[PDB]
Amino acid sequence: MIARWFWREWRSPSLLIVWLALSLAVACVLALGNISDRMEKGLSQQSREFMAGDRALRSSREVPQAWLEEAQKRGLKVGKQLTFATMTFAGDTPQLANVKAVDDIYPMYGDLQTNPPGLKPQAGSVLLAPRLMALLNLKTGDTIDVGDATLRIAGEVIQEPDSGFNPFQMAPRLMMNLADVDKTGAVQPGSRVTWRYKFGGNENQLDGYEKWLLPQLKPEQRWYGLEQDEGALGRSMERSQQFLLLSALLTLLLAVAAVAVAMNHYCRSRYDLVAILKTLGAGRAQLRKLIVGQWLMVLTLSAVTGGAIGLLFENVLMVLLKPVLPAALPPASLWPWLWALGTMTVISLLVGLRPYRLLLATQPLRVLRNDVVANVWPLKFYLPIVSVVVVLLLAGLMGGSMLLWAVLAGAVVLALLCGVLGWMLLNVLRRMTLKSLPLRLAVSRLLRQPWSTLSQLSAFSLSFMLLALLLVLRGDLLDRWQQQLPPESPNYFLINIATEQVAPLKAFLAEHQIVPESFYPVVRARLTAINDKPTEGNEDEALNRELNLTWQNTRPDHNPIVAGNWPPKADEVSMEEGLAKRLNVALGDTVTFMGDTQEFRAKVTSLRKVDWESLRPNFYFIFPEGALDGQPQSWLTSFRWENGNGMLTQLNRQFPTISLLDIGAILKQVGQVLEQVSRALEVMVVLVTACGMLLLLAQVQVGMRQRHQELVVWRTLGAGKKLLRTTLWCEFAMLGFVSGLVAAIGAETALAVLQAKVFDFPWEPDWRLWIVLPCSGALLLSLFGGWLGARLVKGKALFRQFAG
Amino acid sequence: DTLLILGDALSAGYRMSASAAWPALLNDKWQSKTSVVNASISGDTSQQGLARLPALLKQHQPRWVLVELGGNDGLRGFQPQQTEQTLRQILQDVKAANAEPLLMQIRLPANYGRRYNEAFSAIYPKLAKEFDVPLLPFFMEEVYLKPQWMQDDGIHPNRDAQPFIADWMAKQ
Amino acid sequence: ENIVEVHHLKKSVGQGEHELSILTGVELVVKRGETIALVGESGSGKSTLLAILAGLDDGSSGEVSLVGQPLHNMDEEARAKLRAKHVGFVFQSFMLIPTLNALENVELPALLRGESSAESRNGAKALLEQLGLGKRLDHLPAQLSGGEQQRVALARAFNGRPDVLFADEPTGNLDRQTGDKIADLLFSLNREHGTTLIMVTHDLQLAARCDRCLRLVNGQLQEEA
Amino acid sequence: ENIVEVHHLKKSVGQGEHELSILTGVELVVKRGETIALVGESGSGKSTLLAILAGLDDGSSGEVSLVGQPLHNMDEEARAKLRAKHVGFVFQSFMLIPTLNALENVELPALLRGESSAESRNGAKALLEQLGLGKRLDHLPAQLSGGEQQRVALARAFNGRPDVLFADEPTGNLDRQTGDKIADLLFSLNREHGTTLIMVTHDLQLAARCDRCLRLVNGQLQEEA
Numbered sequence A: 001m002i003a004r005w006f007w008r009e010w011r012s013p014s015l016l017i018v019w020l021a022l023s024l025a026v027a028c029v030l031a032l033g034n035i036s037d038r039m040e041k042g043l044s045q046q047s048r049e050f051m052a053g054d055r056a057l058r059s060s061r062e063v064p065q066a067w068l069e070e071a072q073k074r075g076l077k078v079g080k081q082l083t084f085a086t087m088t089f090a091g092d093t094p095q096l097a098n099v100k101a102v103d104d105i106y107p108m109y110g111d112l113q114t115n116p117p118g119l120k121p122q123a124g125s126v127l128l129a130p131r132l133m134a135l136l137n138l139k140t141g142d143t144i145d146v147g148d149a150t151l152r153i154a155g156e157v158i159q160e161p162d163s164g165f166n167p168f169q170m171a172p173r174l175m176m177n178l179a180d181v182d183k184t185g186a187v188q189p190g191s192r193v194t195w196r197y198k199f200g201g202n203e204n205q206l207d208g209y210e211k212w213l214l215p216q217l218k219p220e221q222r223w224y225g226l227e228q229d230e231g232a233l234g235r236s237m238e239r240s241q242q243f244l245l246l247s248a249l250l251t252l253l254l255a256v257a258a259v260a261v262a263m264n265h266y267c268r269s270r271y272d273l274v275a276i277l278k279t280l281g282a283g284r285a286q287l288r289k290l291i292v293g294q295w296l297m298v299l300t301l302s303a304v305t306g307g308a309i310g311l312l313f314e315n316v317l318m319v320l321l322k323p324v325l326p327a328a329l330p331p332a333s334l335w336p337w338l339w340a341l342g343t344m345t346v347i348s349l350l351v352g353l354r355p356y357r358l359l360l361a362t363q364p365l366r367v368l369r370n371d372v373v374a375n376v377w378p379l380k381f382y383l384p385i386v387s388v389v390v391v392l393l394l395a396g397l398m399g400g401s402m403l404l405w406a407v408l409a410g411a412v413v414l415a416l417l418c419g420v421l422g423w424m425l426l427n428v429l430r431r432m433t434l435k436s437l438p439l440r441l442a443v444s445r446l447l448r449q450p451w452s453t454l455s456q457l458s459a460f461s462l463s464f465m466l467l468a469l470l471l472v473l474r475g476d477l478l479d480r481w482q483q484q485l486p487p488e489s490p491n492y493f494l495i496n497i498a499t500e501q502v503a504p505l506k507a508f509l510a511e512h513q514i515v516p517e518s519f520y521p522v523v524r525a526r527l528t529a530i531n532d533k534p535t536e537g538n539e540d541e542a543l544n545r546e547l548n549l550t551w552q553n554t555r556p557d558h559n560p561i562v563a564g565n566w567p568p569k570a571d572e573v574s575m576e577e578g579l580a581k582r583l584n585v586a587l588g589d590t591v592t593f594m595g596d597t598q599e600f601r602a603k604v605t606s607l608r609k610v611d612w613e614s615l616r617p618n619f620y621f622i623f624p625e626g627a628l629d630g631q632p633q634s635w636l637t638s639f640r641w642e643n644g645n646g647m648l649t650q651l652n653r654q655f656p657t658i659s660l661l662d663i664g665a666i667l668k669q670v671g672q673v674l675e676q677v678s679r680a681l682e683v684m685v686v687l688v689t690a691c692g693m694l695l696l697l698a699q700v701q702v703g704m705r706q707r708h709q710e711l712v713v714w715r716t717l718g719a720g721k722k723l724l725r726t727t728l729w730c731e732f733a734m735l736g737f738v739s740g741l742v743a744a745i746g747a748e749t750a751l752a753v754l755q756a757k758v759f760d761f762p763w764e765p766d767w768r769l770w771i772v773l774p775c776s777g778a779l780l781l782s783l784f785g786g787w788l789g790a791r792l793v794k795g796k797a798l799f800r801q802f803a804g
Numbered sequence B: 001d002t003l004l005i006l007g008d009a010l011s012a013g014y015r016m017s018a019s020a021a022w023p024a025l026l027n028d029k030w031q032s033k034t035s036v037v038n039a040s041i042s043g044d045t046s047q048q049g050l051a052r053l054p055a056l057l058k059q060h061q062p063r064w065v066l067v068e069l070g071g072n073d074g075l076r077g078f079q080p081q082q083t084e085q086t087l088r089q090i091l092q093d094v095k096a097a098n099a100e101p102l103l104m105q106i107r108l109p110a111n112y113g114r115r116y117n118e119a120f121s122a123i124y125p126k127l128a129k130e131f132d133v134p135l136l137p138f139f140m141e142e143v144y145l146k147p148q149w150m151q152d153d154g155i156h157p158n159r160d161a162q163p164f165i166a167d168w169m170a171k172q
Numbered sequence C, D: 001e002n003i004v005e006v007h008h009l010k011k012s013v014g015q016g017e018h019e020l021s022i023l024t025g026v027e028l029v030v031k032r033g034e035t036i037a038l039v040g041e042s043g044s045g046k047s048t049l050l051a052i053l054a055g056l057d058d059g060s061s062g063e064v065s066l067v068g069q070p071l072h073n074m075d076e077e078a079r080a081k082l083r084a085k086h087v088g089f090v091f092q093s094f095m096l097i098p099t100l101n102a103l104e105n106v107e108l109p110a111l112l113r114g115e116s117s118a119e120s121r122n123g124a125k126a127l128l129e130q131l132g133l134g135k136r137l138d139h140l141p142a143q144l145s146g147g148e149q150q151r152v153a154l155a156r157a158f159n160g161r162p163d164v165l166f167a168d169e170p171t172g173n174l175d176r177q178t179g180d181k182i183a184d185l186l187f188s189l190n191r192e193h194g195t196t197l198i199m200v201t202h203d204l205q206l207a208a209r210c211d212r213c214l215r216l217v218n219g220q221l222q223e224e225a
Ligand SMILES: Nc1ncnc2c1ncn2[C@@H]1O[C@H](COP(=O)(O)OP(=O)(O)NP(=O)(O)O)[C@@H](O)[C@H]1O
Pocket: A369, A370, A371, C013, C014, C020, C022, C040, C041, C042, C043, C044, C045, C046, C047, C048, C049, D139, D142, D143, D144, D145, D146, D147, D148, D173
């Protein structure tokens, strides 16, 4: 009986378009969620591999073995590493070397590359850094005395995965087996030996052992993972996670808006059927069962189709992007499934609940003749309830993150602005006279039904502002990362350079065809008093440890002056904004520094932005030339060179007192991480843009379906196809222009809030958005409407299709 | 009478205020009779110490000078001949300018390598005998078996060890 | 005996300037078995008066009693039950289902009454074939003419088998022969089953055929024939 | 002189068993100024025959010439231009816009013709007031009766001001007085502007008033009056 009902209704155009929109939204949301979850899992896995473990425990001495026995009983894999330093001897030449000792478990995660590759730390042989090998002029197969024991040299080490990203490890790397350490006899009380403990396994047992060890923790022990790290890479990972969550939120909201519009259209369509079924006096239970059964069948079919399409789409995307993708990601969870299904069902139910009870109470005739409906549940109370419910649901889904607060603030400000500007536009248009035909036609169409115009305007505006926010955030993140990592960054550093030694060093660089950058002077001084008040007792790190003051002559390139003037004059200093805030220092304040038992005062005359993520040298204070000439000055410099290693040994022999630092491996790893995340973000933004375009197309098609009867009446009367296309172009272009105009301010507000309280970056207004968004949205909507109208106008005897 | 201190963060004060460092504590203990002034700077080399030497010598002009340098040079690793010659020149300059040098016997940690540790530790008695100056012992060994007196790195003693260091130096 | 009673029924539509007064107090007494015709001009309120007489809407004021039950005192559920029990209605635009065929459209009330598919389909087929619609069983209302849709609505009303039947413009879109056949069928049903009939049409002959004739002038009913 | 010419026009709807033959070859000659009435029974094909005569649809076979132009040889754009230039049509369900009021509905063709708002609104108001619809300017078709909707459709057709007017059931939902007024207005327009009129109705008197009368039997036209 009802099977034929549903089969015939599935062919009906309105139900067909509603079901298509629902299925497309479900599929796109599910695919996006699965892709985001798999990308996040891959990022976590690669972070663990970079850390060579899942949990890290660093100790200065020996921890009790009973805890490791408990971990073994729990099944977690635990590995011990011992790091220290020694003074080895290439014949007579002494040299410091950073010795590391691991078991066979290492590498627990990631991969270790040696020279030749494939070598592993084994007994009877040791490994040296290529820089160390060149410095000691040894080679593979040689025997060297490390500590107090002589062992053969297995080879060089290309790179170790667990090498800390610390640009201060001056000691060259030495590697030896953990069993041979007692051969050297270096294990003695009072030795600076660091015990690293790597833990790997399923997160359930990880949490179990973590909570088991929590009461047993000691101050000498540092237990952590990777997200808790304050390193720049960890913060970037957190930002990427927040970006993925924001993308999920945006696609969820777009799906919500699309399905809300579809449900509104469906409920308005069902009016005639409701009226006729109520006319025959059908039982309330019977009619309720019929209507809810049809609605639930539509929802179930849409959900099944969306799930199948999402799975197929994810498989196709993984197949296509595999060469671009680093490796096969681990499978994701089923949480996106529940997210999408619950979102769809809840939104549809909340949209359709009020009309159902309203038609139950209202008499069928008043519905048929559009008489005054029963004054029950006015929209003035219905809308706030819906807003509160959806806000609570989103907060429960995403744990009440501040980004959700920013998004909802943007949404509400967009809604109020849309309402006010719509009222003003209605007044002005009623005060406006025209002369062209399609303009007047579009004006009339807008004026006749203002509420549908407001709804479509709000939907288009929210979609446009969400897309603009996504694009702007992606562009800002990419630009900031590109600024932070110049591709021409130097790969070697020279420190502890003497002022008398720079000229021989400069000649050495010039002979070696090396163009050096600015030679940073360094003076070690402490900010003792601020505004004649001593800083002792303050727990701020800058007021407790030593400060590295410096002077320059050219304006900083990566530190534009936000407040103040460049350059600072005599007794004047350019200060960092963050330090000024954290030390309650304003412009013009007197800062007193003590260095080399010499006290000097300066006036804060310039506030500057400093990003510690930048690999360039950064300072909390900048002085003009001549401010600290009398203070003792060391010198720091950096250069890029990859041609051979003999010149490095020659420089070390010529300048033994000058410290040499290698950062090549760290630079390579951070570049790999940044490019991987950049590819991930680019793919994510492309797919989100595609889904947003599809949803906008669905909404425009819904609007065309709603205007189908009047369009077909016009065509029946004899309206030209060119005239209809121009009218649609004008109407949808005006709609898109207004939507983009309001979306500009909405996106500005949301971006300001999120950048202030999520991404911790300075906010700037962009007039380029204010110009591009309205015209671009208008063009997109006009093209979509023109294509849809061109498709609809095709056919013969279209007047017979007026009813449908 | 004034005592000038010229060394590393062991006396400069690693990640602590100027008053938090042990030389300030010793000055507080010796306010009445003999003031103590600290001129130590972290990370200095023998050449950098020589460069900073004239300014401190002219600014302070003390009766005694505490010269504890080369420990960080040994930690980073210098060839014995070069650092020995530089320290010899520094001591000659200190004794030339009417200032009594105080050389601290520094012994590298036993894990640093027995041969180099012995070679570097044997320098200090030779210099003390040559210049006829007292050689106070390596009191960081007294901190070797005191984890509560050290930090996470194990290189610099914590603020809790600073009173102990000041007391030990007052005894010496 | 009196199945329909009306006292001071008034209806007004609109607000302020848009407000319009349709009725000025209606008094009507109708017993079982009567044939009542309504006459007037277009826009005079015959359709809305018939609709509120059927109890589907509430007027501005007045008392309406159907089969000795106060419809205004009842709720929508009781009125729906009464309609499903003894009331049938025929509109002007035929209010037909676009997604259903004629046979299913006429069989639907019997299915809603819990009758089995076989007997309901047989009765629907008989009602359609006696109206000459046996060749349009699978056709849709959009695929059919206005007269065919009117006949489908009449067949659905017949399938309802009510004791009271309100119809508006039953033969407006029919030729003389089809109108005569429909009138003969309606009169035969009224004479056999005793079903009260209230028809609104502009056909003077059909109106005269009714037992009583009322003209709607200035929101008031006047006996005419 | 002959404005409408029909040769062997045939129309068939359906496929296979569902296939139905509507026309069996139509030959028709109509000059300017004639009044043509169409008679028959419901479902006989009068509506579809009139619609394909207006050129809105293509039959199974045949030649149709309107104002001396082969409609079958033209595209949809040319037919739309011809309709906007000289053709007006009146349906059975009045095909009215639910989201527009009567005044805007009748003013719409003049606006589509590029006329200014003031003159178009004045003409629409005159057409509505001469039909007695001056008190329902702001009312919606759902708010109005079927006769009011029919009058709105007729007023829209009048606002089109065509040289040829096809109408189906022009006075079906009207009383005698309103039907007489509409017929008088149509005849006056035909006699003044020379506009050809082709009306399909079941009113025998109105059909006899026309210059020619054709009955549609078994998909064929027969002269009757
Ligand atoms: N919802 C409404 N809003 C405004 N006016 C209305 C509404 N419903 C009815 N009216 C007015 O009441 C009149 C009567 O409607 P109706 O009962 O259909 O007239 P009628 O004379 O029975 N027409 P017919 O049966 O076609 O000859 C309408 O024509 C309007 O003038």
